[PDB]
Every structure is written in structure tokens, then in C-alpha cells.
């Protein structure tokens, strides 16, 4: 019973402002000082393609229940999310906004917003996690279509109608906006490159893939066409409520930590639906990572329960490429999965090989006799061709997790191979630069082996190790094997 323009933002943010000396980034990994400076209804630029302005929608699009789950969100950001939905959406299409407070420290963060028109608050009595919280919200939802948003988002002009139009036409489409960037430091709202879509490597964390030449050519042909995507990050999407329920909601055995990308993306595609990015729908999001999760590290274990629950149900034998990338996950308890395996059987879903061939053929699968695969990492750097060809030197370069010049395998024949080129010891004197040369099956100069717990790369039949100490002076070398940081190299997958 307060209309949103009459909500007192100043009093709400209130005593939760950052005191001088307190870390502005402590509450939620973005600058709360800058978030608190903004008005709840602050103007943002219209990042849509100009062709999006030429669209008109029927008044009878199905209304949605917007479900926003949160845990210790910054009050200013939570309010601005809610206001953006209310300000930018035709009111008839917002049946309700359900805030699911997942046991935040202060119940007032959510409760005070319940005074706003259309906003209902459900508070969990313990921290349940995003997926269980979303099931609670979806169960409470009165509308025929569910919209899931995160708690630090800002909806743009006519963001909702394009999403609802897709789902009304075909209930098996699960659709997402193009996600614009709200800068974590200065809160400016900007658009990212149009040539990026969701993806993942074998470690199973969400990443952005650069579109292939074919995908980019297609996009240029119609920059406002819906784009099929192999994976959503899992934060923002719209789904017909009955389809959500029929397909198995979310797995209620998921915990708080991660994996919200995985299970739903695999299940929707394998069980006959699709995922889409809708370019005329724009929602900004406060992205919070500098650098997206890196392995090895503790992330592999932190996200393992939820990740294994997806992998063990959906991925068939391809789960073993995940365990090759994330060996720390192999023995992490993940709970019983018989209910979800029964669901998979009941729904007559396709195998994971079908997903890889038809939905994500860009994900490179190791050859069946590869010894190791992926990128060859040293700190945050990667073995890199530097765009060279035969007779060229090789280098190190910051790992960009985009494949390309950083894509390698240690083959059955013990070669370190990129396309048709192999690392070649052209000169055995210590200190000599190695070169790319065409792969030749019985060239002893092209044979390498992992040593010291798969932490170094030794040239077979020698006491020479791959060494980056020469990088500044021209490229990678062979050097007498020794206890050197510059001789540490590890493939992302050991098979």
C-alpha cells in the first residue's frame, strides 16, 4: 500500500550506509558507496538495437510472477532491482514480485519492501540456497509464467514483452535477456559485445564464449533475432510455470553453493526444450568477478556438490572429463540422485552426446587416446602459439580461456599438439628455443612427458624440461630440469 514512487528510499537505505573506514565492498563484492548514491529509479541508457523500437505487442501477453531470491543484498541494489521491474514493465504483466529472503542477517531488508505495491516477501528460516529458494517462490506464484531475476539487476526499456512473447508462442522456450553490465566500481550501465553468448569448459563453471564465424555471420544478418544458447548463467530467465513444474522444477537437494547454470541448462535441452537469448530484452547486472573461477583452487570443492549432482544425472560418460579437470571433486559427497535419474527416464531425455553434437558442438572433446588436454598452464599464463606457424617460436601469454592459440593436447604419441603443429626440440643445447613444426609420428624431437605429479613437462629421453625463463628473449626453451618456477606446467585435464 505504497506506490513505488512514494517509497522512502532515504529512510530504507538508512543506517545501512557505509561508515568511513568500512570496506565499501564488504557486504556484496561491489561498491556499496556508489550504489547508495543512486536513486531507486535512476535513468539508464537504452542499449537496445534500433530495430527493437519498431515492435508492438498484444495486450493479452501472459502476466508473470517475478521471483527474486536474495541473501544479504545491499539495500540500495535490492530496492533498485524491484523498482526497475515496476517502472519498466507494463503493470498488467506484473502479477506480483515475490522476494525470497534466504535467511538474510536482517529481516528488515526484505520486510520493509513488502510495503510496496505488488511486493510479497517470503523469508526462509535458514539459508536454503538459490535453487531451493526459487522453488519456494515458484510454488507461491499465482501467474502462468515465472520470471527469475537476481537481486542486483536493472531492467531496461521494454525488457519484459519480448521474453513473454517467446514463451507464450512456445512454452518449451526458456528465455533470457541480453545481460548488460552495471560496473561493480562506478555503477555505470553499459552494453557488452554482442558477439558473446554463454558456454562452459570441462570444469563446468559458466563462461562467455566468443561466437564462431558462422554465429557472427548469422547475427549480422539479424541482430535482433533470438539466439539459441547452450547454457545460461542461471540468474535471469523466463519460463512457463507449467513447463517449469513438468520438467522437474529445480533439484531440491542442491545446496547454497553454485551450479545454478548447469542442471537446468542440461535438463531443458536434453528433455526437449531450448534456451534463448533475446536481444531486444536488456537487463543490467552487477557482475562481481574480476577473473572468472580458476582451477586448481578451492572452487572445485566449494561448487562440487551441486556440480556433481548435475554431472552424475545428465552427463553420462562425459562426466569423466569434468573429473579430469576437477579431480578434487571426485570424492565430494553429493547425495542420492535416484529421484532425478527417475525424472530423466520419465521425461525421455536425450543423451549427453546428443547435447554436445546438436547444442554445443563448439565444446572440444578430448580424443579417446589423449593423455592430457586443454590448456597448458603456468600460474595465470598459458602455452600459446602467439599466432605462429611452422618454424615459429612458442610463448606464454595470459590465459584467456577462449581456446584458439591456447588449445593443446598431449597425444597418445606423446606430442604436444595444436592443430597440425607440435612442440619440437630443434636444438638440444640447454637454453635453446623450441619451435612449432608439423607433427610427425616418429620424430623423437616431438616427444614429451608429464613428470613430478603432472607439474612439469620433460622432453622424453632427456634431462631437458620446458622452461619459460627465456620468454622475454624470444620464447619457450628447453633447459636442464631443475627446481624452477619457470618449469612448472600443468594441463587443465589429465586423462
Amino acid at each position: 500500500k505504497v506506490r513505488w514512487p512514494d517509497f522512502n528510499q532515504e529512510a530504507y537505505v538508512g543506517g545501512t550506509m557505509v561508515r568511513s573506514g568500512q570496506d565499501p565492498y564488504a557486504r556484496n563484492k561491489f561498491n556499496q558507496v556508489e550504489s547508495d548514491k543512486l536513486r531507486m529509479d535512476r535513468a539508464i541508457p537504452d542499449t537496445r538495437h534500433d530495430q527493437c523500437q519498431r515492435k508492438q505487442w498484444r495486450v493479452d501477453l501472459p502476466a508473470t510472477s517475478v521471483v527474486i531470491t536474495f541473501h544479504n543484498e545491499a539495500r540500495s541494489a535490492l530496492l533498485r532491482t524491484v523498482v526497475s521491474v515496476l517502472k519498466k514493465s507494463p503493470p498488467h504483466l506484473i502479477k506480483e514480485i515475490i522476494l525470497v529472503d534466504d535467511y538474510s542477517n536482517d529481516p528488515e531488508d526484505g520486510a520493509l519492501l513488502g510495503k510496496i505495491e505488488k511486493v510479497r516477501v517470503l523469508r526462509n528460516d535458514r539459508r536454503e540456497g538459490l535453487m531451493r529458494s526459487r522453488v519456494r517462490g515458484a510454488d507461491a506464484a499465482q501467474a502462468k509464467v515465472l520470471t527469475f531475476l537476481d537481486s542486483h539487476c536493472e531492467c531496461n526499456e521494454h525488457w519484459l514483452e519480448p521474453l513473454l512473447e517467446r514463451v507464450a508462442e512456445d512454452r518449451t522456450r526458456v528465455v533470457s535477456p541480453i545481460i548488460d553490465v552495471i560496473n561493480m566500481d562506478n555503477f555505470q550501465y553499459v552494453g557488452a559485445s554482442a558477439d558473446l553468448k554463454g558456454g562452459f569448459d570441462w570444469n563446468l563453471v559458466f563462461k562467455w564464449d566468443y561466437m564462431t564465424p558462422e554465429q557472427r555471420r548469422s547475427r549480422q544478418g539479424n541482430p535482433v533475432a533470438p539466439i539459441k544458447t547452450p547454457m545460461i548463467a542461471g540468474g535471469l530467465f523466463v519460463m512457463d510455470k507449467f513447463y517449469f513444474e513438468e520438467l522437474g522444477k529445480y533439484d531440491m537437494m542442491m545446496d547454497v553453493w553454485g551450479g545454478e547454470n548447469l542442471e537446468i541448462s542440461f535438463r531443458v535441452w536434453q528433455c526437449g526444450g531450448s534456451l534463448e537469448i533475446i536481444p531486444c530484452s536488456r537487463v543490467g547486472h552487477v557482475f562481481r568477478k574480476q577473473h572468472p573461477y580458476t582451477f586448481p583452487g578451492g572452487s572445485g570443492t566449494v561448487f562440487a556438490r551441486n556440480t556433481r549432482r548435475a554431472a552424475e544425472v545428465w552427463m553420462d560418460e562425459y562426466k569423466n572429463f569434468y573429473y579430469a579437470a576437477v579431480p578434487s571433486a571426485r570424492n565430494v559427497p553429493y547425495g542420492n540422485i535416484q529421484s532425478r535419474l527417475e525424472l530423466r527416464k520419465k521425461l525421455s531425455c536425450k543423451p549427453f552426446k546428443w547435447y554436445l553434437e546438436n547444442v554445443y558442438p563448439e565444446l572440444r572433446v578430448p580424443d579417446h587416446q589423449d593423455i592430457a588436454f586443454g590448456a597448458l598452464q603456468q600460474g595465470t599464463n598459458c602455452l600459446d602459439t602467439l599466432g605462429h606457424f611452422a618454424d615459429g617460436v612458442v610463448g606464454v601469454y595470459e590465459c584467456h580461456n577462449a581456446g584458439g592459440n591456447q588449445e593443446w593436447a598431449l597425444t597418445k604419441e606423446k606430442s604436444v599438439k595444436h592443430m597440425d603443429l607440435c612442440l619440437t626440440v630443434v636444438d638440444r643445447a640447454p637454453g635453446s628455443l623450441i619451435k612449432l613444426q608439423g607433427c610427425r609420428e616418429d620424430d623423437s624431437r616431438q616427444k614429451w612427458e608429464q613428470i613430478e605429479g603432472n607439474s612439469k613437462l620433460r622432453h622424453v629421453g632427456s634431462n631437458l624440461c620446458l622452461d619459460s625463463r627465456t620468454a622475454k628473449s624470444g620464447g619457450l626453451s628447453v633447459e636442464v630440469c631443475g627446481p624452477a618456477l619457470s618449469q612448472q606446467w600443468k594441463f587443465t585435464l589429465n586423462l
Binding site: 538459490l130 537481486s151 559485445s193 564464449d209
Partner: peptide, 16 residues
């Protein structure tokens, strides 16, 4: 509830 921290949409600044 929360999502995990999401990566800013970026990729390599060179071409393969």
C-alpha cells in the same frame, strides 16, 4: 538465495 559472482562478458583481445 544468491547467485555466484558472475564473470564480466569479455574474451580474448586477439583472434586465433
Amino acid at each position: 538465495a544468491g547467485t555466484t559472482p558472475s564473470p564480466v562478458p569479455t574474451t580474448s583481445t586477439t583472434s586465433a
